[PDB]
Paper text:
RSL is a C3-symmetric homotrimer with a six-bladed β-propeller fold and two sugar binding sites per monomer. The three N-termini are located in close proximity at the narrow end, and are typically disordered in crystal structures.
In the MKA-RSL – sclx4 and MKAA-RSL – sclx4 structures, Lys1 is encapsulated by the calixarene in the known binding mode, involving at least one salt-bridge and one cation−π bond. Elongating the N-terminus results in greater steric accessibility of the lysine, which is now favored over Met0 for sclx4 binding. One sclx4-bound N-terminus is completely ordered, with clear electron density for the Met-Lys-Ala extension. The sclx4 at this site also binds a second N-terminus through exo interactions. In the MKA-RSL – sclx4 structure, two of the calixarenes are slotted between sugar binding sites while a third calixarene resides at the interface of three trimers, interacting with three Asn79 side chains. All three structures feature calixarenes slotted between the sugar binding sites of two adjacent trimers, with hydrogen bonds between the sclx4 phenols and the primary alcohol of D-fructose.
Author numbering:
A (entry chain B), B (entry chain C): -1 to 90
C (entry chain E): 0 to 90
Write the structure that this text describes.
């Protein structure tokens, strides 16, 4: 037997904002916290595995989510215009 | 399930402090580095999968560990005085 | 089939990003510093991977936790190649 779900998390600021990504049944979904209750975020993309990182540029948050199915990893980018596909490629 | 290690890691400051969480045999445990050697930490909760994030408020560390068993993810919170279950829920 | 597993870290405001992929028992690394993705020097065995990093001034320090079976090896970047770290556990 093995685990059936897999998560990744990032956070920023002192409130804080938290984003938790869960890969389950080939789909990644997003839960969000910014100090007043958990809610479902806009991120919804295919994937059996997820990782995430984020950084601030001044006050603006930038998020990168790496979603993998099979040997294909797709990078998704939050830069202030919704989620967009990133340039990331890998030869797996 | 059969013995098998999966980890998550976070760090803070410049020393740094590092915390590494290991899921194995249905339990998540914690190893700690504060600049002078590895030692075992207080975190010990059920789980087959783990992710983590942390943030500083001044010099106080806050840690959130997302422990998953089956399709249920439980958030565990360190805010300076023991690990407590957080409000996180998801619908997996 | 078999799905790869990744871990990611980033630093600064450009930013720099490092993405580690565990694929068929080996962990490799892809890198971004603002001018395209390229393959990094990290190459170690592992079924599972996590990562963290911190800045000391402008200098990045990266720790990659690579696990096979019940054994986790820490790999350390401190400016001059990857070295095995002191991390141990009794899994
Ligand atoms: O040393 S190895 O990791 O190569 C190994 C492989 C297999 C093995 O059967 C064993 C070791 C022996 C063994 C060890 C353990 S442990 O003490 O937990 O390490 C447990 C078992 C076992 O046979 C029993 C066992 C439990 C389960 S579960 O509880 O349902 O998860 C599944 C299995 C078990 O054998 C099936 C199994 C899985 C796996 S896999 O590593 O998950 O692919 C390898 C082997 C297996 O027989 C095939
Ligand atoms: O395009 S699909 O991904 O849908 C596809 C599905 C199946 C397929 O048979 C193929 C493609 C053809 C095919 C492609 C490739 S590839 O060029 O590398 O992408 C490889 C294979 C293949 O049949 C060979 C193959 C490899 C493996 S593995 O080495 O263990 O990963 C498993 C299988 C293979 O056929 C079995 C298999 C699994 C599955 S699963 O449902 O995804 O588990 C679907 C199909 C399969 O043939 C059924
Ligand atoms: O405030 C919620 C939100 O906009 O935060 C940034 C990203 O996590 C988005 O997916 C998410 O919907
Ligand atoms: O989203 C914009 C972008 O340039 O940000 C830095 C890296 O994440 C790149 O892969 C990505 O295309
Ligand atoms: O000093 C060690 C410790 O208190 O650090 C904060 C948390 O990681 C705790 O679980 C851990 O025991
Ligand atoms: O103080 C604990 C808590 O409020 O911290 C912020 C979030 O992690 C919440 O889910 C959690 O319950
Ligand atoms: O500039 C690329 C590089 O040196 O960056 C630091 C580490 O990620 C190394 O593995 C990598 O080769
Ligand atoms: O300089 C390497 C080292 O001391 O860095 C801090 C920790 O990652 C240790 O396990 C590691 O050996």
């Amino acid at each position: 037997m093995k685990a059936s779900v897999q998560t990744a998390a990032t956070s920023w600021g002192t409130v804080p904002s938290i984003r938790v990504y869960t890969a389950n049944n080939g789909k990644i979904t997003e839960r969000c916290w910014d100090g007043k209750g958990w809610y479902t975020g806009a991120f919804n993309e295919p994937g059996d595995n997820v990782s995430v990182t984020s950084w601030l540029v001044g006050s603006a948050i930038h998020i990168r989510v790496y979603a993998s199915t099979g040997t294909t990893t797709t990078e998704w980018c939050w830069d202030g215009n919704g989620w967009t596909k990133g340039a990331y490629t890998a030869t797996n």
